[PDB]
């Protein structure tokens, strides 16, 4: 009794959703799309390489101008690169050498970093004195930060190892809203184009769609078998892709509330570190532990190409807003731009 | 190349100059990862959300790290050594300690990292086996056939170090080895032991690259 009645109700609810999800699976996305011409072979070549990092690169984020990017490394350095001229714009020292995330504000006036210090640090770049000074040191998370994304110059969402996500007011320095419901460590975080929702991928082999204003979970997605390391919304905003350690990408639909396709091959055993889509969403780019990246056809689950230029783990991967270039950062302390 | 971007190129050169000069400064320091449990007493090893302690022995830099299941352990892929602290007095939690040591020894990211292992609070073990109120043969039945290769204390000490060494020698193919030690609260020659152990760790890698041993 007591907890037994609640446990039985939870089990019945889970079975109902499974039946409800099955009632909408009239036709597989693979079946529908087996009439379109394949994209063929994608021949992307290393155009510009970025040197200067001495330790492993753990994160990288593009700018909204599609020219400046910021990268974080274990050497306690944040570097802002002018990708067109390979020039170094800034070299921000870090109080902690342990960083796992890096964010670049949409306005370009701020950058964010975090890691094992359990702190999101926000650096103001467009100041007087011609230097870069820390403007906010967000504290309150009891676990390591995995990912942080800027909403605007005043709001930021952080993913931590305390199985929770938070929304911060930078000026006040407080947690406006906390997000609870994950069982394992939350590893990834992607913002929707309309900014009103975001998805989080955690070590519980599940993904959750959250409402920023409401603060409550709306949809939970469970189709994986291992930890989820990467996540990324479809450009439309009605779908997202997740990468796991089981060597498998899956595309989930928000409205259908279930998986659509799986991206897997028998010769891939290594886990997935980072995923992102292209400008039109036709190409899904995933980084792996086997020193290279794969380009998937998002509608037919076919390997369109391979990005093989790194001799260590590809940790971070990003696609510009205009879709011109793709940036890959690896554990070999190198950043490569592909076109 | 215009006037401003030529000046921007010169700024990048100075940034590169500072990047390489302080990278050399960090190249001369040795990074250590401190691991243990609540009762291990790992804070009071070297008298000197992540806590960093620094100590220098014979003019070499040591930079210790303290964090506090382990998804971040891949960040410590290139540390000089791992320092593991175990409370030998607590017989009940020893089985937990061996399970943690086995987990940390066979980690996919630490297959080539040596471990310096400290049996902290060796005095509490001395004034517990002699009393005889608690017997370590209860939790591990095989202390029954005890032999030393007070004896009751020496065999008790050697049995515990053998339990940890057996896990270390089970796998690894000799790439990384353990350095058992016995310590106490009043002991002060601890940074020296890490100094001697870290010297052997570096020497062995130099020997391997010379294809000598």
């Amino acid at each position, epitope marked *: 009794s007591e907890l037994d009645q609640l446990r039985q109700e939870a089990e019945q609810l889970k079975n109902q959703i499974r039946d409800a999800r099955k009632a909408c699976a009239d036709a597989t996305l693979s079946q529908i799309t087996n009439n379109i011409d394949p994209v063929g072979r994608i021949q992307m070549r290393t155009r510009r390489t970025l040197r200067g990092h001495l330790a492993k690169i753990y994160a990288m984020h593009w700018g909204t101008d599609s*020219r*400046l990017l910021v990268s974080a490394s274990q050497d306690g350095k944040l570097i802002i690169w*002018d990708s067109y*001229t390979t*020039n170094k*714009v*800034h070299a921000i020292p870090l109080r902690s050498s342990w960083v796992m995330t890096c964010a670049y504000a949409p306005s*370009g006036n701020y950058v964010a970093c975090g890691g094992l210090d359990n702190i999101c640090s926000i650096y103001n770049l*467009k100041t*007087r*004195e*011609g*230097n870069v000074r820390v403007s906010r040191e967000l504290a309150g998370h009891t676990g390591y930060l995995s990912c942080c994304r800027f909403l605007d110059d005043n709001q930021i969402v952080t993913s931590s190892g305390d199985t929770t996500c938070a929304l911060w007011d930078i000026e006040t320095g407080q947690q406006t809203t906390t997000f609870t419901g994950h069982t394992g460590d939350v590893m990834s975080l992607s913002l929707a184009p309309d900014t009103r929702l975001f998805v989080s991928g955690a070590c519980d082999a599940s993904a959750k769609l959250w409402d920023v204003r409401e603060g409550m979970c709306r949809q939970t997605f469970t189709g994986h078998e291992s930890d989820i390391n990467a996540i990324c919304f479809f450009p439309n905003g009605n779908a997202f892709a997740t990468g796991s350690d089981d060597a498998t990408c899956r595309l989930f639909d928000l409205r259908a509330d279930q998986e659509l396709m799986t991206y897997s091959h028998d010769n891939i055993i290594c886990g997935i570190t980072s995923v992102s889509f292209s400008k039109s969403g036709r190409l899904l780019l995933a980084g792996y532990d086997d020193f290279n990246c794969n380009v998937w056809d998002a509608l037919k689950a076919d390997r369109a190409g391979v990005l093989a230029g790194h001799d260590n783990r590809v940790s971070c991967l990003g696609v510009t807003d205009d879709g011109m270039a793709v940036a890959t950062g690896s554990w070999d302390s190198f950043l490569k731009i592909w076109n | 190349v*215009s*006037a*401003e*971007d030529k*000046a*921007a190129a*010169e*700024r990048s050169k*100075m940034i590169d100059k500072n990047l390489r000069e302080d990278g050399e400064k960090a190249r001369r320091t040795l990074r250590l990862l401190l691991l243990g449990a609540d009762n291990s007493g790992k804070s009071t090893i070297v008298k000197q959300g992540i806590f960093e302690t620094k100590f220098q022995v014979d003019k070499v830099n040591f930079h210790m790290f303290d964090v506090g299941r382990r998804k971040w352990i891949q960040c410590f892929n290139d540390v000089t050594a791992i320092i593991f602290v175990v409370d030998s007095s607590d017989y009940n939690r020893l089985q937990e300690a061996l399970n943690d040591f086995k987990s940390i020894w066979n980690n996919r990211w630490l297959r080539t990292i040596s471990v310096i292992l400290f049996l902290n609070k060796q005095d509490l073990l001395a004034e517990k086996v002699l009393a005889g109120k608690s017997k370590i043969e209860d939790y591990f039945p095989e202390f029954a056939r005890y032999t030393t290769p007070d004896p009751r204390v020496t065999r008790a000490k050697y049995f515990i170090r053998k339990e940890f060494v057996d896990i270390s020698t089970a796998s690894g193919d000799g790439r990384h080895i353990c350095y058992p030690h016995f310590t106490c609260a009043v002991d002060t020659e601890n940074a020296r032991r890490i100094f001697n152990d870290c010297k052997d760790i570096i020497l062995q890698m130099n020997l391997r690259e010379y294809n000598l041993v």
Partner: single-chain antibody
Amino acid sequence: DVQLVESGGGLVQPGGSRKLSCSASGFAFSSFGMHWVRQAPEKGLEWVAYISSGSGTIYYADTVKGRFTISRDDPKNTLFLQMTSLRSEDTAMYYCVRSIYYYGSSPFDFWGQGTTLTVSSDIVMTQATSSVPVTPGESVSISCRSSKSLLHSNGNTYLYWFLQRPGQSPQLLIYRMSNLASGVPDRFSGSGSGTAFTLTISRLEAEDVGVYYCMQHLEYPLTFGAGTKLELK
């Protein structure tokens, strides 16, 4: 907070030597390239010398080359200008200008008070207007032309605008023909193409009067316009 305080100057006999010094206190002096700009007794604005951050690049105007020396003391947060064999043509107010150079930077942002010194293949930028009658609340357009196209092959056009109110050092308004300087009201705007540039001021008010100066940064020697004065009615 940011301040550039000048020192030196005075009455110097022709053929003498002098050493002007400007002290910087309030910003990262080491990371800033620095310029010297004079302004004749009652004439225009002329560039003199430049020293890069780290003292790795030094440029001089042809007038002062071989008899002017510019240096900086990073620990002392000061820069100097050692003048030798100075003549009557060197009598001017010597402004000291800070400048930084990266992508999206704002060079020539801060100017210091000048030093009054009294001695007893170039791009020509033409500001045809020299004085325009202006009524408050009206819209004012100032035109500028250059002998060479400032639009570079990288998409950046290197033209700058400055305002010098009476009794004050010039202040940056527009950098690269389109970007408002920090602290400049939104009523200022700039547009144009190579060889043809225009500064538009909407809803002109008080403290918006003075001399407006053009400048190129496409090629050293950096050169100014004559200057267009705005006066009341």
